[PDB]
Design a protein around this nucleic acid. Structure first.
Lengths: 162, 161
DNA sequence: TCATTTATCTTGACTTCAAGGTAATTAA
DNA sequence: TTAATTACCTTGAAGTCAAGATAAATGA
């Protein structure tokens, strides 16, 4: 049995009038994600990085040289508000990971670009990150990892549709 | 999928790496994020946030008199005690929980559901299930079944370590 | 007793968001 | 030109955590 099976048992005893089967799939998902974050966050700390600081540089890096994106691009992709993004940017700017370049095509726009410092950090952090994930999923058998990828995508399909 | 995009990017920017793991894990992380959004819609109909729901649900599912310890609570909900102290003081102001002094441990102040809280949670969980039932209805039965089975195997490895 | 642990809160700080603000941009 | 919209930041406020503190329970 799994920890989700436990909570279902509790509800099965306390409210037998309900069918809590949906809580099964969804409960496992949230817990998995929660634990998974803990694993990945461990490795990021090895680089003196928090989870969000990594997401920023990975987004800038994966864009492509010159690795320059807009605050709006950033928060639109990272699903955070603008005030959130402002705070993030000022921090990374002080940590010399990003520089601020003024948009020559839109005066209400101040771009964010990777510094040489930041470009090196993320370029090896992405290397560690990948292996960290590879280690985690190695517990699963091939068929299992295969099925999970296929199935989660369908779930993402349905969710993104709505 | 949106994850498919990020994979194409890394395949161009760092072809020296194989980013296959980001696939499964990326979808997982995003799904959880989207799933929370759906659930929070319904919680808002009861004037409740995600954690306020998790709290009363934990107290409710314990069993009458629905009395648990702060340590028990934060241990189950994986949050620090200062988080829990703050949380409890809020719910106490919102008349959902009462504070009972432990007669068996003088360093202990138990947390129990009020008549108010018991009613709110007893119908909120009903809506919550339906919320989830509808969301997952987009998936076929076999697919939802396989996803459940597969997610369970993943939870074993994660919790073991 | 005691030197250590446990239960729980207190403080300072960081991240986040909703709401507002303001300089540019835009289409008529 | 203007009224509406976009880009980005500012400002309170809430939630969270990490140390730290202090009363209470230990087992020797």
């Amino acid at each position: 049995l799994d920890a989700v099976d436990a909570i279902l048992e509790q509800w099965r005893r306390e409210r037998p009038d309900l069918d809590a089967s949906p809580m099964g799939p969804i409960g496992r998902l949230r817990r998995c994600a929660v634990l998974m974050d803990q694993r990945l966050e461990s490795c990021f700390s090895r680089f003196d990085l928090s989870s969000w600081e990594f997401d920023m540089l990975a987004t800038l890096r994966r864009a492509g040289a010159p690795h320059c994106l807009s605050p709006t691009e950033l928060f639109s992709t990272l699903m955070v508000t603008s005030g959130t993004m402002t705070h993030r940017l000022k921090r990374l700017e002080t940590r010399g990971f990003i520089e601020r370049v003024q948009n020559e095509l839109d005066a209400r726009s101040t771009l964010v670009q990777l510094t040489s410092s930041g470009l090196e950090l993320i370029n090896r952090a992405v290397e560690a990150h990948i292996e960290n994930e590879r280690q985690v999923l190695s517990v699963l058998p091939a068929e299992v990892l295969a099925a999970l990828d296929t199935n989660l995508a369908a779930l993402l399909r349905g969710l993104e549709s709505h």
